[PDB]
Design a binder for this molecule. Structure first.
Ligand SMILES: CC(C)(COP(=O)(O)OP(=O)(O)OC[C@H]1O[C@@H](n2cnc3c(N)ncnc32)[C@H](O)[C@@H]1OP(=O)(O)O)[C@@H](O)C(=O)NCCC(=O)NCCSC(=O)CCC(=O)O
Ligand SMILES: [Zn+2]
Lengths: 274, 28
């Protein structure tokens, strides 16, 4: 049963089980191509594939590029095999992933970091082509070797960027995992504090905030309460601008910008697919 | 379009369209 994966120059311990064919699933280790995601039985098999394999980046269209950081939109109907490999590889780190076979109704947004050998996988998120619940992310993953460095937040930011350009409001697919919930809360706090640092009006509706940020009104309200910024004095509902939080957030925004762990809207070249 | 959950041990219900007043510190 699978315990580790060789992935480019990294050797990654798996978290959960994923339904790879029992031929492969019998082995402890699994070698895979870091550019096409085909999986293979042995180091020596991989070396032959790498010598043959043409792909140096995901399939699909590069809709974002800022230097070495890209995002590729992959249609699950036009690249079924790639998206299935991507879903099997994801279930290795998701406690529960809804779907791995029927990838045709999904888009996958694949984030990569380029060095001189090609565009390397950072993480991705899947999105339903047509969601009845207006979910803007179905699943999201930062590859382990890149976790806890700000990439997850960049992926979340991107999913909302797409929502704005679509003129829609979005939300991630319930249920959210522990790691998913912590990261969305962090993001939502940052978006809310930023908005309030910039608004000057005496008042604002939740809908107004939702319209600008593409964040769903319930997640807005939910975050307000998480921050203890929703009060009820003299018979009315108020939003409290906490000076501490905005101050603390500014120092954090300085550190994020000091690195480059931020998505930049002027580098998106996208029109919605359908 | 309304939402609920308590604040300081009191259950409250709010609208997402009504403008909410923003305030700073101010004696409350
Ligand atoms: C959720 C992500 C994508 C997070 O990616 P990153 O670690 O790069 O996040 P980041 O941008 O560096 O930081 C995001 C915020 O979360 C904090 N943070 C990140 N990882 C943490 C961890 N293990 N423990 C405690 N805090 C953590 C960071 O300090 C930061 O908070 P501060 O800024 O406040 O410091 C990842 O953990 C992941 O891929 N997990 C496995 C897959 C998963 O759980 N996906 C989400 C399930 S939700 C879903 O809808 C899919 C499930 C399904 O329906 O199929
Ligand atoms: Zn390959």
């Amino acid at each position: 049963m699978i315990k580790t994966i060789a992935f480019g120059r990294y050797e990654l311990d798996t978290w959960y089980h994923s339904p790879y064919p029992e031929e492969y699933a019998r082995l402890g280790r699994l070698y895979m191509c870091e550019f096409c995601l085909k999986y293979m039985k042995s180091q020596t098999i991989l070396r032959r594939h790498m010598a043959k394999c043409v792909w140096k980046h995901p399939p699909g269209d590069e809709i974002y590029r800022k230097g070495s950081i890209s995002v590729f939109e992959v249609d699950g109907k036009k690249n079924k095999i790639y998206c299935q490999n991507l879903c099997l590889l994801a279930k290795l780190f998701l406690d529960h992933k809804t779907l791995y076979y029927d990838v045709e109704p999904f888009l996958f947004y694949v984030m990569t970091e380029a060095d001189n050998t090609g565009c390397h996988l950072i993480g991705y998120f899947s999105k339903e082509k047509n969601s009845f619940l207006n979910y803007n992310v179905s699943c999201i993953l930062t590859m382990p070797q890149y976790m806890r460095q700000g990439y997850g937040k960049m992926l979340i930011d991107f999913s909302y960027l797409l929502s704005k350009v679509e003129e829609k409001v979005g939300s991630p697919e319930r249920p959210l995992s522990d790691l998913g919930l912590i990261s969305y809360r962090s993001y939502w706090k940052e978006v809310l504090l930023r908005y309030l640092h910039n608004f000057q009006g005496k008042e604002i509706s939740i809908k107004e905030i939702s319209q600008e940020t593409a964040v769903n009104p319930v997640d807005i309200v939910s975050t307000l309460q998480a921050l203890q910024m929703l009060k009820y004095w003299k018979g009315k509902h108020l939003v409290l601008k906490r000076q501490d939080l905005i101050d603390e957030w500014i120092a954090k925004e300085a550190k994020r910008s000091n690195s480059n762990k931020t998505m930049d809207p002027s580098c998106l070249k996208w029109t919605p697919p359908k | 379009g309304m939402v609920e959950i308590e604040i300081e041990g009191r259950l409250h219900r709010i609208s997402i369209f009504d403008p909410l007043e923003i305030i700073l510190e101010d004696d409350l």
